[PDB]
Every structure is written in structure tokens, then in C-alpha cells.
């Protein structure tokens, strides 16, 4: 009879991101003329931590292409990125770790990160800590590059969309156990209000579809349709299969 908590987070009031101590958005520098034809060189000045990421950032210093100034550029770093490194950025840039060059120019079987799903949107794929994409092939009739995303789900992207070379920095993070509810307090401190997580069976029937009863049970089957309304779509949303996955590992996604 009352609104479900998952529906309430879309109002986004108490549940927005905790962004006051965050730095800017981490993206690649602007796809200008200087990268469509040549390379821009920068230099890494600082390796940075912001709250709510597990990957290290980097401010790289370019010269502005058209004015007498220098552009501070906050990128997310790969592993091995040291201060002073001279990142190169563009078409004629070489094939080294830290450089950003189009996917047409990166030979096959190469680990890339900060790959972008359309040219110019400044990096949208493989940016969580320790992730990377692998370049499978190129097609020169269509001008598209087909690469393996960190989930295994393949994706064909245009070969003019650029990518950085390396693993994303800060990898190995999930492999240590948290051990405390105190350490999960501060993990979600710089993220957003989503912790502690109360189970639906622990609720009353007014708050959640699973709530109520004299035993904490889900009554109905907990696999809901894709077409369920907001409020009814809780549980295992459109589950193709449930249970302990006994066997291989299917890639998850459409």
C-alpha cells in the first residue's frame, strides 16, 4: 500500500551520489584536429584518489592547441602510470602503455582500457578498477573494430574511437574480505545512500511484496516478469534460470 524502497530511490533525494569530495569526471581529452591527424603529448603530474572509486586517477598536462595555456586533464590511470610519464594522445602516437590512439591503429590481441563506444564521447567502456578490453579483429570494409568487453560480451565499435592502453589501475580490490560492518560503512560513505540492506521478507506487507506472514517466507515465486510494474518488479527480475550455477559460466546480458 506504500511505495517500495527501490521505487523511492528514483526520486533521488536522500539517495543521490555523495559527490562533494569527488574530483571532476574522468574522461579522455577532446577529440580535436590535433588527434585526428597527429599526436598530442602530455605529462603526468599527479596520481590521485577520489572518494568512491577503486581506481587511481591522473592529471595529465597538455598544451592547449590554439591558445597560450595548458590544459589540466583528469584521466583514469592504467597500471604502471608514473608521474612524469609523457602520455601521447592521437593518431600518430606509438603503441605504449598509457597512450591513447584509435582502435584502427592498435594491432589485434591487445589489452586496452578507457575504450569508447562511439567516437568522441571520451571513454565509456572498461573503467572500473582492473578491467580491460581485448581487441579481437578489425574489418576494413565496414571500418569497425570488434572487441571483448570485461563481461565477455562482444561488441563491435567504430575503429576511429580511441582507447588507452593497459589494465585500469587499482586492480585486485575485491579479493580482500571486508570483515567488518565498519569497513562497509566507509566503503559506501563516498558513494551514495544504499547501505545497510534490509531484506524484503523482514518487512511488512505494506512496504514490500515479500513482507509479512508468520514465517519469513516469500509466498509467490520470486522470479518476476519483465513486464511487471514498478512496485511489483522486485525479486529476481526476468530470471532466465535460477539456482546455483552448476557448470560453465554464461555471459550475462542481452
Amino acid at each position: 500500500g506504500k511505495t517500495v524502497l527501490s521505487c523511492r530511490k528514483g526520486n533521488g533525494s536522500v539517495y543521490q551520489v555523495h559527490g562533494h569530495k569527488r574530483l571532476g569526471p574522468a574522461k579522455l581529452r577532446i577529440l580535436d584536429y590535433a588527434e585526428r591527424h597527429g599526436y598530442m603529448r602530455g605529462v603526468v603530474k599527479s596520481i590521485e584518489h577520489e572518494a568512491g572509486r577503486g581506481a587511481a586517477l591522473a592529471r595529465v598536462e597538455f598544451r592547449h592547441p590554439y591558445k597560450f595555456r595548458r590544459v589540466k586533464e583528469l584521466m583514469v590511470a592504467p597500471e604502471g602510470m608514473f608521474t612524469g610519464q609523457s602520455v601521447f594522445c592521437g593518431q600518430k602516437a606509438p603503441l605504449a602503455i598509457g597512450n591513447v590512439l584509435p582502435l584502427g591503429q592498435i594491432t589485434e590481441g591487445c589489452i586496452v582500457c578507457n575504450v569508447e563506444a562511439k567516437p568522441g564521447d571520451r571513454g565509456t567502456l572498461a573503467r572500473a578498477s582492473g578491467d580491460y578490453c581485448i581487441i579481437i579483429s578489425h574489418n576494413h570494409e565496414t571500418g569497425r573494430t570488434r572487441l571483448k568487453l570485461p563481461s565477455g560480451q562482444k561488441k563491435s565499435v567504430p575503429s576511429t574511437s580511441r582507447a588507452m592502453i593497459g589494465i585500469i589501475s587499482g586492480g585486485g580490490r575485491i579479493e580482500k574480505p571486508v570483515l567488518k560492518a565498519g569497513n562497509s560503512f566507509y566503503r559506501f560513505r563516498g558513494k551514495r545512500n544504499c547501505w545497510p540492506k534490509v531484506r524484503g521478507v523482514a518487512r511488512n506487507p505494506v512496504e514490500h511484496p515479500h513482507g509479512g506472514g508468520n514465517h519469513q517466507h516469500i509466498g509467490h515465486p520470486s522470479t518476476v516478469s519483465r513486464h511487471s510494474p514498478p512496485g511489483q518488479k522486485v525479486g529476481l527480475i526476468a530470471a532466465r534460470r535460477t539456482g546455483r550455477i552448476r557448470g560453465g559460466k554464461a555471459v550475462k546480458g542481452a
Binding site: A34, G38, R41, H64, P65, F68
Partner: peptide
């Protein structure tokens, strides 16, 4: 006035 060189006109 090459790319990366002196800032242009």
C-alpha cells in the same frame, strides 16, 4: 605551425 608546435595565428 605544425601540430604540437608554436601556438598558431
Amino acid at each position: 605551425f605544425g601540430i604540437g608546435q608554436d601556438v598558431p595565428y
